[PDB]
Structures are given as C-alpha cells and as structure tokens.
Amino acid sequence: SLHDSLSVVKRTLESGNVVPGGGCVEAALNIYLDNFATTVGSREQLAIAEFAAALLIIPKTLAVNAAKDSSELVAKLRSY
Amino acid sequence: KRALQNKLIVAGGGATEMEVSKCLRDYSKTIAGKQQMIINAFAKALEVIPRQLCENAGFDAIEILNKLRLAHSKGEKWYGVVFETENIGDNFAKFVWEPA
C-alpha cells in the first residue's frame, strides 16, 4: 500500500503545473468564455457561446455517472 | 385608437422583449437547480419576436440581434428593430410603441 500511495502522490507532484479537476476547468471556461463571446458582435459570438456550452458535457456526464441529478450538480457549479 | 384608450405604453419593435430578456439573464445568475435552465430558456424564447421581425423583413437577424443585445447593455432600454433603414434605434423616440 505504501508503494501504491507514493506512486499516486508522486504522479500529482510530478506535474509542476496542476489545475483542479472535477469540472472546475470546464465550468470555469463555460462562464468565462460566455463573457468573451459578448465582445465580438458578429458571427463568432455564436460559435464561442456554443463552444463554451459544449464543455459542460464533462461535469454533466460526471454527475450522471455518479448517480446524482446533473441539473443540481452542474447548476450549482455555474452559480459558484 | 389605442393612442386614446391606453395611456400606459412601452417601446415596441422588440424593445420591451429585450429589456425583459436581459433582466431574466441577470436574474438567473442567482438561481441554482432546474429553475436556472428554465428561466434562461424563457429569456431566450422571448428573442423569437425581434428575431422574426428581422427575418420576415429581409434583415440580417444575426447582426441586428447581436447589436440589440450589446447596445441594450449600455442602459438604453428602448433599442429595437428599425424598419426604415436596417439598423437599431430608439423605437420610443421614433413613436413605435405598443400598450403595456
């Protein structure tokens, strides 16, 4: 077990730059990119908005696989 | 007729729908759960009016809707679809109004 635990912690530490998972990146980009879209006002505003929305498939899928109601788990992320 | 019967008016040409849609998009920012998605869907559905007003008139609905959203965020709550020359403008000053 110690050999396993050291491998798990090492893998995390090996990456000099880390970003929180669990939907943090996708949910954060969803909101940030949605604001970005508002600076265009042409055609890319729609492509950016749909691109941003697409990233929510990850926290949505994770919630469904957890047997939890994605409509609350994902919505709460958008709020936070 | 309505100019004499209804003293309480709001700007037309989608201007009223734009202000409601905006206030809904902001309201939903404080709502969590299933209600958030439905409120936003309502805010989106309201845009069917300025959308179809543009499309049926032969206008570039995508450009006009984008200009309406962005121009409205500046605080001018009477922006709407102009049918004289394809653009957006103050439909209250231009006397394009509907009873409240």
UniProtKB/Swiss-Prot annotation, chain A:
Q: Which domain of life is it from?
A: Eukaryota
Family membership: Belongs to the TCP-1 chaperonin family.
Q: How does it assemble?
A: Heterooligomeric complex of about 850 to 900 kDa that forms two stacked rings, 12 to 16 nm in diameter.
Could you say which residues form the signal peptide? none
What does it do? Molecular chaperone; assists the folding of proteins upon ATP hydrolysis. Known to play a role, in vitro, in the folding of actin and tubulin. In yeast may play a role in mitotic spindle formation.
What name has this protein been given in UniProt? T-complex protein 1 subunit alpha
This chain's source organism reads Saccharomyces cerevisiae (strain ATCC 204508 / S288c) (Baker's yeast)
Q: Where does the UniProt annotation locate this protein?
A: Cytoplasm
Swiss-Prot record, chain B:
Tell me the compartments it is located in.
Cytoplasm
Q: Which domain of life is it from?
A: Eukaryota
Give each disulfide bond as a residue pair.
none
Subunit structure, interactors included? Heterooligomeric complex of about 850 to 900 kDa that forms two stacked rings, 12 to 16 nm in diameter.
- Chain's role: Molecular chaperone; assists the folding of proteins upon ATP hydrolysis. Known to play a role, in vitro, in the folding of actin and tubulin. In yeast may play a role in mitotic spindle formation.
Of which family is this protein a member?
Answer: Belongs to the TCP-1 chaperonin family.
According to UniProt, the name of this protein is T-complex protein 1 subunit eta
Q: Which gene encodes it?
A: CCT7
Residue span relative to the full protein: 401 to 500 of 550
